[PDB]
Each structure stands twice: as structure tokens, then as C-alpha cells.
Amino acid sequence: DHPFTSAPTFGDFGSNQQAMPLYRVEPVYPSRALKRGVEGFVTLSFTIDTTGKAVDINVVDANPKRMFEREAMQALKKWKYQPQIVDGKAIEQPGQTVTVEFKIAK
Structure with missing residues (x-):
């Protein structure tokens, strides 16, 4: 693919087993909390x-x-998940939780 001229910023990864949509592979990072300096976390059930x-x-x-709680909350909502059962991430789970540590940019 030959998209618009642009490049990535930092590196990210998600080892924890959480439910990720098809439009938001990760939570929407804030603006202030990002410049703050603290590295809390977001856990939504x-x-x-x-x-x-x-x-x-x-x-x-x-x-x-x-x-980062606000963005994490609004994100889980705005997020979009498709009912597609595939090896790894399936559907039908009344007990799904997403916990990811928020590390401030370097």
C-alpha cells in the first residue's frame, strides 16, 4: 500500500489477553495525561x-x-467489534476484561 507520507512515533505491544475491536487495536491516548508523566492503567470489564x-x-x-480513564471508557464504547469467531479472539463472553498499562511517551 502507498498511503499518505507519514511515519510511526513509538513502539507498542499487548501481551495481555484482552478484547480488541477491528477499528481500535488500542485505547485512545489522551493529550494532557500523556505529557503529565505518570503511567497508570486502564481496566474495563x-x-x-x-x-x-x-x-x-x-x-x-x-x-x-x-x-486515561475517560478516554479508556469512551473508547470501549465508540469501539466497534464484529461477531467473527476466529482462532484467538471469539465471541460470546460475559466476562471480558481489558487491562493495559499506559506508559508516557519517551
């Missing part, structure tokens, strides 16, 4: 309906204070 619908958005734990 939601259920993926068999029809590929992410609902019951309920946070269990996150940053030490209003930082």
Missing part, C-alpha cells in the same frame, strides 16, 4: 454480545486519578 456488541461497560480499576 465489559461483555461482548454474541452479535459482536460491546455493552455493560463497567470499569473495575484504572489510573490513580482522572487521567
Whole structure:
């Protein structure tokens, strides 16, 4: 592919087993919290309906204070999941949780 002239910034990775959509492979990083300096985390417990619908958005734990929790919350919602059962990520899971550490840019 020959997209518009651009390049990546930093490196990212996700070892933890969480439910990731097909439009947002990762949570939307904030602007202020990014320049802050703290590296909290985002833990949201939601259920993926068999029809590929992410609902019951309920946070269990996150940053030490209003930082990346907002974006993480709104993200899980705005996110879009498709009902496609494939080796690794399937559907129908009333107990799906996504926990990822937020590291400030270098």
C-alpha cells in the first residue's frame, strides 16, 4: 500500500489477553495525561454480545486519578467489534476484561 507520507512515533505491544475491536487495536491516548508523566492503567470489564456488541461497560480499576480513564471508557464504547469467531479472539463472553498499562511517551 502507498498511503499518505507519514511515519510511526513509538513502539507498542499487548501481551495481555484482552478484547480488541477491528477499528481500535488500542485505547485512545489522551493529550494532557500523556505529557503529565505518570503511567497508570486502564481496566474495563465489559461483555461482548454474541452479535459482536460491546455493552455493560463497567470499569473495575484504572489510573490513580482522572487521567486515561475517560478516554479508556469512551473508547470501549465508540469501539466497534464484529461477531467473527476466529482462532484467538471469539465471541460470546460475559466476562471480558481489558487491562493495559499506559506508559508516557519517551
